Amino acid sequence: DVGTVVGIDLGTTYSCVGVFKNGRVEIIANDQGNRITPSYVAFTPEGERLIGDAAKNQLTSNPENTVFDAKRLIGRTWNDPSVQQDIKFLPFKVVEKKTKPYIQVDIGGGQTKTFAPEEISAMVLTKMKETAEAYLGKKVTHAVVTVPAYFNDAQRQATKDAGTIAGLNVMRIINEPTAAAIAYGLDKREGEKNILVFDLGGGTFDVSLLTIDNGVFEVVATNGDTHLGGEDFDQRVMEHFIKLYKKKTGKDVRKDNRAVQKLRREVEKAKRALSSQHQARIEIESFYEGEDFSETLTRAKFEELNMDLFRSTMKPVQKVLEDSDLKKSDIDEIVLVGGSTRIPKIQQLVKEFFNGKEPSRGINPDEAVAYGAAVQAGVLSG
């Protein structure tokens, strides 16, 4: 008896879980009321392991003990050129063990631990499992987990292995863009269609061209930017306000880890607010050296600070069309994935690229991948 199988989007920056409950797919809010959970792990002074919102939100003078982006390393060998570049930029220690990347952190009480990427991912999966179990009022043992379409055999197996550590039998690994298309019911249609999936997540940008032919998907071509996402838009705003603060006060706040973390938290909140408002206030009590911070950010300024990054998302779309031997007019559906596709300017740019065709966001773009995973999981449940 496999019980009730859940669907999990195990994301680079954010993860999401869904399940078929009473004849309906439900995207499940965690204990903080959020339907997405940061793929983050940290530790309290007492050595309590924090996972998710609690990990990402913990203020710390030692950010090197906060782990995230394990998906960038999972299933890769040490001298993978991707690993060699990412270890330059990740703020926690990644060390070579047995010719593979491992993550080294202090976990409280002066104790150091080294973790495989799949061990970090397993902790994230455990949190997602617990979120689902609380909602269902029952134990969960089996899952369908999603991965990027470009993931290779080793990365897929490593993701299953993360599940095993977390007490989950990952029965199926399915592709993210396909899961998004399945959320929209595109698998349950007679005939053939071309589907462009535009997936701008927290850390990565993936564009995929899928064909769907009587319920069978083919991933025809993929492109994007492995280091472009919502976090980068936040950083542009961060840099803007750090510069402004130094101009106004003479102080460079980059000296204080906790001050930068506070500003980051408020920038993330302001950015989200600017998807539905034209201005947002950023206010921080005792920001730096006991002085308060209070500034407004307009949507126009947010857009100006990021316009080059937003425009850069179009070239990968044109490349995917070329590699699929398709023109813009051959695209039957445009599926938006990732919270960053809630940004009015991104939606506008996509619509304009496709000459007025409205991109689909009727299912929350941050939830669509988990939603499709949960549809697939529903058929496997006993």
Ligand X SMILES: Nc1ncnc2c1ncn2[C@H]1C[C@H](O)[C@@H](COP(=O)(O)OP(=O)(O)OP(=O)(O)O)O1
Pull the structure tokens for residue 100.
Answer: 């593979």
Between 229 and 248, how does the x/- string for binding to ligand X read (CB under 6 A)?
-x------------------
Structure token pair of residue 336: 């938006």
Stretch in the footprint of Mg ion (CB under 5 A) among 96-104, 180-188, 193-201, 282-290: 193-201
Radius of gyration of the chain (CA): 21
The interface region with Mg ion, picked from 3-11, 57-65, 149-157, 324-332 by CB under 5 A, is 3-11
Does 193 help bind ligand X (rule: CB under 6 A)? no
Residue 276 engages ligand X in binding (rule: CB under 6 A): yes
Q: Tell whether residue 272 is among the known ligand binding residues.
A: yes
- Residue 339 binds to ligand X (criterion: CB under 6 A): yes
Is 371 in contact with 18 (CB distance < 8 Å)? Answer: yes
For residues 200 and 103, what is the distance between their CA atoms, to the nearest angstrom?
26
Write the CA distances from 137 to 27, 35, 356, integer angstroms.
15, 18, 45
Residue 339 labelled as part of a binding site: yes
Burial class (CB in 10 A: 0-12, 13-18, 19+), 78: middle
Which of Mg ion, ligand X, none does residue 230 bind (CB under 5 to 8 Å by kind)? ligand X
Tell whether residue 14 is among the known ligand binding residues.
Answer: yes
* Cβ closest to ligand X, residue 65 vs residue 313: 313
156 binds ligand X (CB under 6 A): no
Residue carrying structure tokens 């919502």: 230
Total residues contacting ligand X by CB under 6 A comes to: 11
Piece in contact with ligand X (CB under 6 A), picked from 149-157, 268-276, 280-288, 347-355 = 268-276
Strands (DSSP E) contained in the chain are 6-9, 14-20, 25-27, 37-38, 41-43, 49-51, 93-97, 100-106, 112-115, 142-147, 169-175, 192-200, 205-213, 216-225, 279-288, 291-298, 333-337
User: Any binding-site annotation on 82?
Assistant: no
Q: Is 112 in the site for ligand X (CB under 6 A)?
A: no
Q: Please indicate if the annotation marks 35 as binding a ligand.
A: no
Determine if 364 is a binding residue for ligand X (CB under 6 A). Answer: yes
> What are the backbone dihedrals phi and psi of residue 289, each rounded to the nearest 5 degrees, phi first?
45, 40
By beta carbon distance, the residue nearest ligand X is 339
Q: Which is nearer to ligand X, 297 or 331 (CB)?
A: 297
Q: Quick one: 8 or 186, whose CB is closer to Mg ion? A: 8
Does residue 305 contact residue 345 with C-beta atoms inside 8 Å?
no
Alpha carbon 319 to its chain's center: 23
Q: 142-147 and 169-175: which strand pairing?
A: parallel
Q: Pick from ligand X, Mg ion, none: which does 201 bind, CB < 5 to 8 A by kind?
A: Mg ion
Q: Which residues belong to the active site? A: 9, 71, 176, 199
Could you tell me which stretch among 258-266, 267-275, 296-304, 324-332 binds ligand X (CB under 6 A)?
267-275
284 DSSP β-pair partners:
293
Question: Does 201 participate in binding Mg ion (rule CB under 5 A)?
Answer: yes
62 three-class SS: coil
Site for Mg ion in 6-65 (CB under 5 A): 11
Selected from 275, 306, 324, 360, the binder of ligand X by CB under 6 A is 275
Please answer whether residues 66 and 58 qualify as being in contact, where contact means their C-beta atoms are separated by less than 8 angstroms: yes
Q: Binder to ligand X among 340, 347, 360, 376 (CB under 6 A)?
A: 340
In the annotated binding site for ATP, the residues are 11-14, 71, 202-204, 268-275, 339-342
* Residues at the site binding ligand X, with contacts judged by CB under 6 A: 230, 271-272, 275-276, 339-340, 342-343, 364, 366
